[model samples]
Target: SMSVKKPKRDDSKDLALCSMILTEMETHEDAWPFLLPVNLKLVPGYKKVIKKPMDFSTIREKLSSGQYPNLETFALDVRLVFDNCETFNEDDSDIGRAGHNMRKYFEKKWTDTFK
Candidate 1:
């Protein structure tokens, strides 16, 4: 008789948690700037500075497509959104403040839920 107790490769929990957090983040008041990609037409040369353009929509799509191998990578993309915002917007500007608010909310939730 051969018997083995194998560990379950359960990724659903991680996926659910990530999706929940993404939902909350999108609903945030300061999520406007991060909801979608910035218009390159409106802001010329934005791509010149921010080589990797990240937004909630792109993250969502990636999540849907199972592009993120794990939570940490997903979180990295989320943080990238805010980092790009900071790089492009002014510290005291409206969009900049919104990015800060969203980033704070994301970090707090991430820590509270995971850590």
Candidate 2:
């Protein structure tokens, strides 16, 4: 099969977003080209009330284990990880905004996941 080179609705904005967010990482050594910083898990308060690090590994596990029973819970967890509290800004930052947006996409096309 052949493929066509498609484009984004607003690619420049996406590029700007990537440029802003990816730079927040510590090193280029580990963060892969197609993945975010795997070790990153946005926490709250003075202490890192941590869960599974919101990395690529966690993505596979969440599906394999059916970690999220429903879309709401999955959305909640997504927000929790990408909420971007003290360490970051969920509403404004790249991943934060991305998470907010992903909630809809994840739920609508959710069956494509482990569900």
Candidate 3:
């Protein structure tokens, strides 16, 4: 435990960056498609394909609850949302197009903020 101070400092920094990124992500117009979990009732077969559905609201909840252990885990959850989008929707489809746009937006913001 002697060398633990810096790790906690880094964790706080990661949390701050993730919180900021999540805010901007939720503000994106294309973010609507990813704002919530996929409606299993409306979109049939969703459960079969998307074993893990991640969304902005869910991400926020996780962040608020302190569920994320580090920046990379939070980043992975964000990426999962788009990855699931690609797997379930057609590239030319409306939601799919939105996912692509949002993914680009997220990566740009992530790199700008974290890299």
TM-score of candidate 3 versus the correct structure, residues matched by position = 0.87
**Top TM-score prediction, candidate number:** 1
What is candidate 1's lDDT per residue for 60-85, written digit by digit as tens? 99999989999999999999999999
What lDDT score belongs to each candidate, Candidate 1 first? 0.92, 0.41, 0.88
Greater-TM-score candidate between 1 and 3: 1
Candidate 3: tens digits of C-alpha lDDT, residues 18-108: 8888999898878888888878889988988899988999999999998987788998999999999999899999999999998898899
Candidate 2: minimum summed lDDT over ten consecutive residues — where? 25-34
Q: Give the distance in Å from residue 36's predicted Cα in candidate 2 to where it truly belongs.
A: 4.9
Clashing pairs in 1: none
Runs of candidate 3 exceeding 4 Å displacement: 1-9
lDDT of 2 by residue, 1-115 (tens): 2586666343334333322333432133333321443333443332354433354334444634756554455445434544433234446666555555554444444443334
Local lDDT at 52 for model 1? 97
Listed in order, each prediction's TM-score against the native is: 0.88, 0.35, 0.87
Residue pairs clashing, model 3 = none
Candidate 1 residues lying further than 4 Å off, grouped into runs, are 1-11
- Runs in model 2 deviating more than 4 A are 1-47, 61-88, 111-115
- On the 0 to 100 scale, the lDDT of residue 26 in model 1 is 94
